Structure formats: C-alpha cells, structure tokens
Design an enzyme around this catalytic site. Sequence first.
Site, mmCIF file in Angstrom:
data_model
loop_
_atom_site.group_PDB
_atom_site.id
_atom_site.type_symbol
_atom_site.label_atom_id
_atom_site.label_comp_id
_atom_site.label_asym_id
_atom_site.label_seq_id
_atom_site.Cartn_x
_atom_site.Cartn_y
_atom_site.Cartn_z
ATOM 1 N N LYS A 111 0.859 -1.156 0.000
ATOM 2 C CA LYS A 111 0.000 0.000 0.000
ATOM 3 C C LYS A 111 0.879 1.183 0.000
ATOM 4 N N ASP A 139 -1.015 -0.096 -4.170
ATOM 5 C CA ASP A 139 -2.370 0.518 -4.014
ATOM 6 C C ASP A 139 -2.255 1.920 -3.421
ATOM 7 O OD1 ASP A 139 -5.140 1.299 -3.671
ATOM 8 O OD2 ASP A 139 -5.344 -0.181 -2.018
ATOM 9 N N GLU A 168 -2.632 0.968 -8.369
ATOM 10 C CA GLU A 168 -4.019 1.376 -8.469
ATOM 11 C C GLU A 168 -4.216 2.876 -8.181
ATOM 12 O OE1 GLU A 168 -5.481 -2.091 -5.433
ATOM 13 O OE2 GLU A 168 -7.058 -0.809 -6.246
ATOM 14 N N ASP A 191 -9.906 1.063 -9.790
ATOM 15 C CA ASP A 191 -10.576 0.347 -8.684
ATOM 16 C C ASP A 191 -11.878 1.171 -8.353
ATOM 17 O OD1 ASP A 191 -9.518 -1.202 -5.427
ATOM 18 O OD2 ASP A 191 -11.546 -0.710 -6.314
ATOM 19 N N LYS A 213 -13.708 -5.062 -5.842
ATOM 20 C CA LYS A 213 -14.015 -5.374 -4.462
ATOM 21 C C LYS A 213 -15.544 -5.609 -4.450
ATOM 22 C CE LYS A 213 -10.085 -3.081 -2.834
ATOM 23 N NZ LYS A 213 -9.386 -2.386 -1.821
#
EC number: 4.2.1.113
Length: 298
Positions: A111, A139, A168, A191, A213
């Site tokens: 992340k 991310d 992302e 995303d 997700k």
Amino acid sequence: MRSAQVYRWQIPMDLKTRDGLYVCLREGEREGWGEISPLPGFSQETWEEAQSVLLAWVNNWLAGDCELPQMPSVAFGVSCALAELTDTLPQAANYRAAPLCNGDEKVAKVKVGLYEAVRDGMVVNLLLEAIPDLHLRLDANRAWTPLKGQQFAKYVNPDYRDRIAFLEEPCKTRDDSRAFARETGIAIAWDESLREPDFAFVAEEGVRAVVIKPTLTGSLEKVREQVQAAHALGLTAVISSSIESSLGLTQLARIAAWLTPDTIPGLDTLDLMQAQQVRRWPGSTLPVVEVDALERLL
C-alpha cells in the site's frame, strides 16, 4: 419451500471491530450463505442501513418476491447465497492471496500513500531490487497530486518498473492517473473508478488491470460482467478484499478461482482480525466462531 436466517456480528481487530452480517437462505435441502458487510469509508451505506435493507429483502424473499437488492453490500451478500443455493458458485478454490507487505508468479501487495511519496518510492525500489523476480501490485487509493506521483517515481529505477504489475489509482483524477502512467511507464489499475457512474471499459494506454471489491461493487453478476469486460480488453482483473470475515473471504477465493482463474486474488486481510466465523480459511490458525454462537436477527 423457502426458509432463512440472518446474523449480525462484530469481530475484534488487531477499525476497532469489523461489523457485518450474514444471510443464510434455504430452499428445501439446499442452502446458501452470503456476507453483508459495508466498509466504513468506502461503502456509501452503513452497517445499520445494510441491516435494515437485508432484513426487508429477506422478509420479502421468504414471502416469494423475486426482486434483487440494489444496495451494494446487500446485493453482493445476497447474490452469493443465491448462487450457492443454485450451485452456480463453484466449490473449488486455491485459497491463496497475494501477500500484503511492508519491507523485505511471485506477486505481492504494497500500500502506498500513507508515508510521503519519496519514502514510498524508495521502499518500492528497495524491494524490487532485493527480489528480482518479484512482481508488485501497489495501491495508492488516489493519494497523489501529479507532483506527488512524480516524486514517487523519481526513486524507482526504470529498469525495475516493468515489475510493478499495476499501481491502483495513483492520482485524484483519471486523466492525471493516465498521464502518470504514460510518463513513468508504470502500469496502473482502476478500482474506485469502476464504481463511478458513467465508467466505461475502454482501452487506454498505461492501464493494465482493474481491481474489483465485490462488497463495494454489488452482485456477483455485476462482478462477473466487470471481470469479463476487463478480460475482453486484455486486462487483468483482480478480485479483492473489503476486509470481509472469513466467510466472505472464502467466497471471494472461490469467485477468483472461477472468474479469474489465472490471477491470484487480493485477499490477504484475514490476519488483521481476531477470529474466523462459520467457514475456515485453510491454514489460518485463528479461532473459529460457530453459527450457534452468533447473534441471530431472523
């Protein structure tokens, strides 16, 4: 004949608790389960609002109604129960996720956007340098301005950039994310974007993947249409965790095996929690909470 159960729960974390619900639908001898767990800060709906909608929907389905829910977390949780009831959610799964990393197809997740951009770039280069056959998914969750994006890339050796499988949503705007991609040669993924009105699957230079997700997205059917649309453009589609309990995480494992067979899913979130419930994630040593011990609402 139709019957059902509804549970509510709160799991302690290592988010102080993870709060959610489950639905059990039965028809005859068949049975299907689903998890309805909106994620604070990502889902528009709250736990309480999801609870109301799921109880109503269940009442109506018990009564014979065929209408499906629109609220995303409920839509997801319900679609899984129904797919299970009809045996359309395959059982098979590898139960393997891309590991979530800090510092240390070999695929791993990091992340970014928590520390400053330079630190993230340095951390990333170190890893990549350290493990030459490592492929990293990064991310950002739209953390950066164009400048910050430049700041991050500056510390990342160009010759390792091909090993960033995707980063992302680097930037606040899609155009800026696209620009970052083109300029740095670092692939990106969408995303949050897919959840915006008017999103269209289009070929775009620099875009290599989408992250879905399901808990944020909606029904399994909708998740399948998005996976497919991604695939048709040649993109990688990753099924990803919304910090579901073990029950929904396992289901996500099965959805990935089924719809994204060659793509390891982003489900490395179980260890953030203190217990599993109802269904075990293979290999986890967390305790398991049985149905009998959950708060039943219906």
